[PDB]
Amino acid sequence: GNATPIPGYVIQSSAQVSDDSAVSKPGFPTSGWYPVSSRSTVYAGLLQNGKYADPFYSTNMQNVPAAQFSVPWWYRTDLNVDDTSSRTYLDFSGVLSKADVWVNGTKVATKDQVNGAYTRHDLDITAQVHTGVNSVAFKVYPNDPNRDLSMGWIDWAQTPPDQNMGIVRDVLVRRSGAVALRSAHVIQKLNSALDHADLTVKADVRNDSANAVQTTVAGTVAGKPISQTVSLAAKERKTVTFPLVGLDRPNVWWPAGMGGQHRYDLDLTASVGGTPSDAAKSKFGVRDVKATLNSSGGRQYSVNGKPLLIRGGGYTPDLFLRWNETAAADKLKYVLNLGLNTVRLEGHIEPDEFFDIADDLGVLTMPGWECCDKWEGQVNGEEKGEPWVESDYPIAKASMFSEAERLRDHPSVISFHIGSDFAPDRRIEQGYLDAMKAADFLLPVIPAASARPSPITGASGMKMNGPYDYVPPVYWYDKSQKDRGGAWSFNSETSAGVDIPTMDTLKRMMSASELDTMWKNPSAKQYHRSSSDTFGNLKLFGDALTKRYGASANLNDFVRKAQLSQYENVRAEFESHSRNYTDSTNPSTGLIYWMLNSPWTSLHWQLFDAYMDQNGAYYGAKKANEPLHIQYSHDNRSVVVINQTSNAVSGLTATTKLYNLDGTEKYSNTKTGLSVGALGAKATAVTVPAVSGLSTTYLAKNVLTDSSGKEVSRNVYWLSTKADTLNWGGSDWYYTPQSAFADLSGLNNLGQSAVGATANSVAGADGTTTTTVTLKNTSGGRLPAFYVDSKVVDSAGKPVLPVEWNDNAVSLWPGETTTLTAKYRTADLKGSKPSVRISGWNTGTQTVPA
Ligand SMILES: NC[C@@H]1[C@@H](O)[C@H](O)[C@H]2[C@@H](O)CCN21
């Protein structure tokens, strides 16, 4: 029943090994070999040993000699074995790109067999293995994402010097008797009422002994006893199907906020001769998922019979695949703190623990294969990625089987994308469908993330029309342009491009000269945007910033205007899709922001940055996705209430007020007694009329109060009398240009106001600290404290990360008070007392103790 992951390896280039067979013999000298932990790429391992400088800073990464990664590298460990009574197995995946496998001097498998990042292998090594010290070595071959059915980085970042070559999941050393137990899972079916479920337990048994046996596979599923006895010839594998098991009132798994996230347990032992031979424990969820095309042809998801607007972002792991379980939980928690329900994974499909965590938190996942390299090389034409040869087809098929087998019992998984930009052809699709069938993977199969259909599964129901770079907020409200990225159908991957991180992050990722160049010349290439020429610079963003907010006075000015621009755009991006979700015709059915986070330190395509800091894009998404939310439509001036919760709400008041930058109220409306249905339904409070007398730049304050009088949503907009308009005719694939620009430059001259702050910190029994901060606009005038940003910092004024606020980037009118809560791990203070740093657009900066 034993499965023990290999803790670590020493690695070295094959340049230093002239007899392969000598690596895996007990006693082979490893003078100068680099010690690495489990799940390390080669570069990750060399970084761990301090061999190269931090690639998150400047062009450090450019300075790594890449040539050394065009040959094999070895991963070697010893393995103590006290006994050869039990058989021995290597069970693993995550080899990029392929490897030879050696045990004690014998080559047990070649790189023709062990090939493909996602392919699992189960190598019986009983023959080679002896008592005492054993050695095992992988000779891992160079990775080329266009040639290998592997992982590559598209245009998200810059190419990692080793191209991730190595072993990026665990290798398990399994022991067991004559019978090996594999592939235990539970098929689960819920009635439409959600009060009864039927369970089919399936589990493979394999007799690897030389003699025929009887085996009993027994254990528990969801608290219920199960038992089957079968015969196995020598070397025979059987799939055991257990009789149906009824489960009354199942603790149904729900997305976050819609209920609990219970997983049930399956626990099994294969015995031989009234003696345990192998055992496996796993978990599953009781949850129904559907993804169907609506009458408009848009892909529509529903969980346990409840339709959902998918609101999420494209997730990426670390650029060098450095794995850390807490980091993964921390990233997934941010999804919830943002109010998002989903993460998309375009390839780079994470280790299991990532999905246990998503399961435990109720964050929905949309895994799948990636575009723009080998996976799509047979269908994607001149796009990078090599046409397939015959040997590719089984690797591809086996990869789906292995992934489908990993993922089938994780309730968070809602579909698998078998294509990204291009749908697979018939042969390739049939190989995926058969693989999924054989794995009992029963989830929706989405043929592509673009509009392109597959020959069997058919239409995707999704759209990939861009944009991926600067568009103004009103663009997101377009339903007129069918080749564009407005709020309709299912937006599988889109954003407004550049997302300048916080000043603290910037100072950690870029040099003074690099930062100088960023604001002065946005047209210049940035190593920390992308390797692609199309997205190598910040020009479009730079141009729009200057035009819309006014020319940048200095770096501080640029960055402060970037956050406003990012908050403004991401907010509208999400808000538009929330509003249009309940349209009769061509509703929005999904939005995946490109992207949730970055593989590394970046300037684009992110909500939270590599260090988990939180900027304007972060707060904008968080604002847009509040559970009970008031918003302003950039297209038609409608004030809309959105209810993301699972129950209808009543007796709401929606209050809208416009202010000039001198603080003069120019419009007021109070809409009492609104009702709004559950899970994304909306209500209209008012359409703001054309108000005469507004300053060119002005403010809109939207406030939502429940029937108890509690303020439940506050939303402040900086608007212009001068409209954003689009030159549609002049679009290309990645953005639509502007024919005219809004004038928000008024904000440059907004008078100073004040705040107004007091902070206290409680150190909990769960290892977390809560810092509470009460803010008050203390000014004696009529000017609001606009865009007030609070940060939990240590004694040196360095932000404490990760962190989770109930709310932030707030705007308070004179006399007004809000109380904010920040939760974080007490140990992440590293002994410091907590403080709070408080910066407003027009309030300067102060730090208070906490
Ligand atoms: N999977 C679609 C790809 C993304 O992987 C890529 O980052 C983005 C842009 O290059 C436009 C195409 N789109």
Structural biology method used: X-ray
In which domain, by residue range, is 13 found? Answer: 1-177
Q: How far is the CA of 764 from the centre of ligand 1 (A)?
A: 43
Burial 762-786 (b: 16+ CB within 10 A, else e): eeeeeeebbbbbebbbbbeeebbbb
Of 749, 771, 802, at which residue does a domain stop?
749
SS3 147: coil
With CA atoms as reference, report the closest residue to 593 among 306, 310, 296.
310
Pocket-testing residue among 346, 493, 530, 602, ligand 1, by greatest number of atoms within 8 A of Cβ: 493
Of 626, 654, 688, at which residue does a domain stop?
626
Q: Which residues are registered as beta bridge partners of 715? A: 702
**Domain match, 497 and 569 both:** yes
Amino acid letter for position 630: I
Q: Is 493 in the pocket of ligand 1 (CB under 6 A)?
A: yes
Burial 312-347 (b: 16+ CB within 10 A, else e): bbbbbbbbbbbbeeeebbbbbbbbebbbbbbbbbbb
Q: What is the CATH number of the domain that holds 351?
A: 3.20.20.80
Atom of ligand 1 nearest to the CA of 466: 11
Residues 181 and 172: their CA atoms lie apart, in Å, by 14
DSSP conformation class of 581: G
Label each residue of 705-733 as H, E or C. Answer: ECCCCCEEEEEEEEEECCCCEECHHHCCC
User: Which stretches of 289-425 are assigned E, i.e. beta strand?
Assistant: 289-293, 299-303, 306-308, 310-315, 342-345, 364-366, 416-417
Q: Which residues are registered as beta bridge partners of 599? A: none
Atom of ligand 1 nearest to the CA of 534: 10
Query: Could you give the C-alpha distances from 664 to 564, 754, 782, in angstroms and in order?
Result: 22, 17, 7
Report yes or no: 505 and 606 within 8 Å, Cβ to Cβ: no
User: Cβ atoms within 10 A of the Cβ of 191, count?
Assistant: 11
Amino acid letter for position 741: F
With CA atoms as reference, report the closest residue to 316 among 131, 458, 152.
152
Residues 432 and 427: their CA atoms lie apart, in Å, by 9
**Domain match, 438 and 482 both:** yes
Residues 129 and 80: their CA atoms lie apart, in Å, by 10
Q: Which residues are registered as beta bridge partners of 667? A: 658
**Domain match, 521 and 438 both:** yes
Reported as type and span, the H/E element at residue 512 is helix 512-520
Residues 221 and 726: their CA atoms lie apart, in Å, by 58
Residues 644 and 255: their CA atoms lie apart, in Å, by 12
**Domain match, 330 and 408 both:** yes
**Domain match, 329 and 457 both:** yes
Resolution in A: 2.4
> Phi and psi of 730, rounded to 5°?
-90, 10
Of 262, 287, 312, at which residue does a domain stop?
287
Q: Is 155 in the pocket of ligand 1 (CB under 6 A)?
A: yes
**Domain match, 488 and 603 both:** yes
Residues 672 and 701: their CA atoms lie apart, in Å, by 16
Residues 777 and 798: their CA atoms lie apart, in Å, by 25
Q: How far is the CA of 637 from the centre of ligand 1 (A)?
A: 32
Structure tokens given for 709:
């009088």
SS3 139: strand
Q: How far is the CA of 734 from the centre of ligand 1 (A)?
A: 9
**Domain match, 204 and 341 both:** no
Q: How far is the CA of 680 from the centre of ligand 1 (A)?
A: 28
**Domain match, 788 and 845 both:** yes
SS3 397: helix
User: Cβ atoms within 10 A of the Cβ of 400, count?
Assistant: 24
Alpha-helical (H) ranges within 603-728 are: 616-624
**Domain match, 735 and 782 both:** no
Q: Is 303 in the pocket of ligand 1 (CB under 6 A)?
A: no
Tokens 């015959």 -> residue: 390
Q: How far is the CA of 475 from the centre of ligand 1 (A)?
A: 20
**Domain match, 123 and 183 both:** no
Q: What is the CATH number of the domain that holds 675?
A: 2.60.40.10
Please say whether the dihedral angle defined by the alpha carbons of residues 529, 531, 535 and 539, taken in this order, is positive or negative.
positive
Residues 665 and 657: their CA atoms lie apart, in Å, by 7
**Domain match, 65 and 197 both:** no
List active site positions: 421, 493
Structure tokens given for 736:
């639509």
Label each residue of 692-708 as H, E or C. Answer: CCCCCEEEEEEEEECCC
**Domain match, 596 and 662 both:** no
Q: Is 127 exposed, middle or buried (0-12, 13-18, 19+ CB in 10 A)?
A: exposed
Residues 263 and 413: their CA atoms lie apart, in Å, by 13
Pocket-testing residue among 158, 370, 371, 533, ligand 1, by greatest number of atoms within 8 A of Cβ: 371
The number of domains in the chain is: 5
Q: Is 346 in the pocket of ligand 1 (CB under 6 A)?
A: yes
Q: Which DSSP string corresponds to 64-75?
A: S-SGGGSS-EEE
Tokens 């050869």 -> residue: 84
Residues 687 and 680: their CA atoms lie apart, in Å, by 20
Q: Which residues are registered as beta bridge partners of 190? A: 197
Nearby residues of 628 by Cβ (< 8 Å), 6 or more positions away: 641, 642, 643, 644, 645, 649, 704, 706, 712, 713
What is the rounded end-to-end Cα distance, in angstroms, of the chain?
51
